[PDB]
């Protein structure tokens, strides 16, 4: 009767050393290689991933899609002392997994989940979630977002000079609206990281843009 999501969530519970991180990762990764595939980021794109978190050390991350937990894992383990993840998930089911995830990893102090559509999550952070401004935003949600849910980060003025914004899937599925965005808008300082898609020896990257305010 298992969902997918939860066959991952039983592959690491029975593989994985309860309390490591690092262990929960490489359980995923094996389980969605040898067994069944699975859109979490991945190792190849999570090595580019965990370079970022550790050039900028965010105190504040926001994540937009969560699934399994998989990139939830991989950068709260790198978050500093009092560093916090907010993490958003519109699907009830996903957003239960994550949170058992983050338990078995021994990391769910450093996170939060959020459960909603990232489109009306976003306008309540300030309000609700005491957001003053984030310091890094990882966009793995569903592509037709990105470009709406960054121009609503800027209007609810949740962006400040050096937020760093992290796209996952810039070339597969793609992202061209996104990209002709940060590309184009003196607002962003951009670089492309070309990579794998998770589990698979097609093309795929993230994009870094950094937001230079006004
Ligand atoms: N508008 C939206 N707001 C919040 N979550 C969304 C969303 N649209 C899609 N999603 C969710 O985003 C997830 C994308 S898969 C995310 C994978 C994850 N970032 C990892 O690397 O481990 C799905 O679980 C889906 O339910
Ligand atoms: O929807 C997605 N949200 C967040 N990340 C995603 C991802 O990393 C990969 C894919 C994907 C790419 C190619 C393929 F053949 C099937 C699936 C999707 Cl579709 C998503
Ligand atoms: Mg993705």
Redesign the pocket.
């Given at each position: 009767g298992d969902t997918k999501e939860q066959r991952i969530l039983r592959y690491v519970q029975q593989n994985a050393k309860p309390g490591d991180p690092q262990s929960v990762l490489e359980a995923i990764d094996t389980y969605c290689t040898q067994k069944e595939w699975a859109?979490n980021?991945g190792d190849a794109k999570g090595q580019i991933m965990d370079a970022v978190i550790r050039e900028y050390s965010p105190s504040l991350v926001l994540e937009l899609?969560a699934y399994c937990g998989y990139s939830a894992v991989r950068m709260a383990r790198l978050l500093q002392p009092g560093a916090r993840l907010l993490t958003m998930e519109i699907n009830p089911d996903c957003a239960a997994i994550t949170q058992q995830m983050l338990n078995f990893a021994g990391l769910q102090d450093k996170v939060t989940i959020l459960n909603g559509a990232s489109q009306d999550l976003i306008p309540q952070l300030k309000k609700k979630y005491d957001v003053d401004t984030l310091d890094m935003v990882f966009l793995?949600?569903?592509?037709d977002r990105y470009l709406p849910d960054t121009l609503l980060l800027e209007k609810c003025g949740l962006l400040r000079k050096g937020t760093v914004l992290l796209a996952?899937?810039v070339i597969?599925?793609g992202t061209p609206d996104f990209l002709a965005y940060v590309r184009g808008s003196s607002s962003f300082e951009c670089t492309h990281y070309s990579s794998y898609?998770?589990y698979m020896k097609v093309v795929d990257g993230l994009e870094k843009a950094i937001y230079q305010g006004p």
């Open positions: 859109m980021v899609g793995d949600h569903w592509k996952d899937n597969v599925p898609l998770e």
